[model samples]
Target: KNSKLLSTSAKRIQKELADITLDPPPNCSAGPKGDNIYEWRSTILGPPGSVYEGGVFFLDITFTPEYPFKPPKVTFRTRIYHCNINSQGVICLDILKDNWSPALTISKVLLSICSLLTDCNPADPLVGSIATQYMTNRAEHDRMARQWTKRYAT
Candidate 1:
């Protein structure tokens, strides 16, 4: 028996899934199957021409019963060498925190995450040293990210 909130969240997720499937975004796959609405698996293609290109990174999204009001917990299931993503796959996105709003949907959140991969917010970074390196040396950052993506994500 799903609560009203859960039912609404599930419906919203279903709608978003429909939208994504109709016109898939670049470098993104919203899981191969769609049996479970609470859990989703997706693959993100590395940003074009970036060190991340040619890499396919996987992510997992878990929605709570208090979703919409509370942002879902998302993590990179695939190991990534990112300044904001820690070893445990925790992300440092503002939208996933107090900044989250009810208006934001799963599709929007995933799209935002995809954008983050290309344009990282170095100012507020989870991995300080890596963020510094990423901000200072583009080549080094690309190389490391590319290597990590290939090793773990590919």
Candidate 2:
């Protein structure tokens, strides 16, 4: 009974849910998990022509009451072979951290992540070795990423 009231965060989250569901981004889909509006599970189909193409990736997004002020915590649930994403599925993205702005929404965040899939930022990466590979042996790096996409993401 005490849970009946919706907080400021809940109302904004509810609007985002409707916005996303009504007009979802390309190759991406997301929704709350069970009855918890604060926790979400999202799917991003690997962008076509990218090494991760043909793969389906999952991510977890957890929003707090300070949302739109404090950015949501987004982490990959599916393993990806990329320098910006570590083996543990932690992502290295600026918008999720310092570059975050109140104007940004979950829809935009997913699109940014999708763009990252096509263009990884090896200059600032979560995995050093992977970044080194990306910087040094371009073909080999892509080959391994493709292999991992086939092995894990597909």
Candidate 3:
């Protein structure tokens, strides 16, 4: 099949793995789940001073053969009470879809996710109810988020 495409994809994926392992970003770590280069498992320790702090969240990253030309699939395995992230781990971030670029890496994406945790864009969200709650009752939203993080992510 598409041998050239696979080779290029593999090369880039492998390089990313090595780079990440050597110099992982703050509060984030990712690597191939096992022997599958295309399937990566990542973890993000809740950022300090954020509602998700003191928790560890898991994520999955599946890359297509197209590599940098296409954004990898990123799904949250850990539950969180966020408007932009749904129950099944679906995210509403722009870079993961429309705003994605070849220059973006898993490290950058993880960083962006950290920022999302810190400051959610409630105006555009995946869960409308959560968004509404976030906007109407900010205190209650943080309480539920903190509670969920304790129950599921810790």
Candidate 4:
């Protein structure tokens, strides 16, 4: 690597890779995309009995050169219907932002996403209409989520 930060990031990526390869988080899988260990392609299977059940959601995770000193840039590559996700597939899960810590790892991030698939935060939603629906007509919100899961996620 060209700098110490880059080298640290590489080693961290390697260790994270080895750990995930040995024992992946439940219903979630994450690994480097192509040959770039600094970037990862992660997938989280929707929790059972949740609105997103049976749907597989994908995310692209890119670690900056600073690595653990900063949080990874994670964005959904899969379309999901929820108060927290919008038409752009962007999410506002707390861990990806201010709550991030060097103590957290890729596995933890993937698990957090899985939990989000089960329980959404309507009060802090990315899609206002979806949040309103989720808070008002719970059944309708779930129905729409189910429909979208079938239409988009396989």
Q: List the residue pairs that clash in candidate 1.
A: none
Model 1 misplaced regions, further than 4 Å: 1-6, 31-34
Q: Score each candidate by Cα lDDT.
A: 0.80, 0.91, 0.92, 0.86
What is the alpha-carbon lDDT for the whole of candidate 1? 0.80
Predicted candidate 4, C-alpha RMSD? 2.1
Candidate 2 ranges beyond 4 A from true positions: 1-4
TM-score, candidate 2, is 0.95
Task: State the lDDT of candidate 1 residue by residue for 65-152, as single tens digits.
Answer: 6667899888888788878888888999889987889888767777888788888888888888888998789788878888887888
**lDDT digits (tens) for residues 1-154 of candidate 2:** 5657768888888899999999999999998998999999999999999999999999999998888788889999888889898878888889998999888999999999999999999889888898899889989999999998889988
Assess every candidate by TM-score. 0.86, 0.95, 0.94, 0.93
Better of 1 and 2 by lDDT: 2
Q: What does candidate 4's lDDT look like per residue over 12-130, in tens digits?
A: 88888999999998988898889888888988888889988889888888998877878888888889888887778787888787888998988888778777878889999899999
* Candidate 2: C-alpha lDDT: 0.91
**Least lDDT summed over 10 consecutive residues: which range in candidate 3?**
1-10
- Kindly indicate the candidate among 3 and 4 with the higher lDDT: 3
Residue-wise lDDT of candidate 3 within 1-154, one digit each (tens)? 6656658888888888888889888899999989889999999999899889989999999999898889999999999999999999988899999999989998888889989999999999999998999999999998999999999999
Off by over 4 Å in 3: 1-6
Candidate 3: deviation at residue 81, Å? Answer: 0.3
| Model 3, residue 32: C-alpha shift (Å) | 0.4
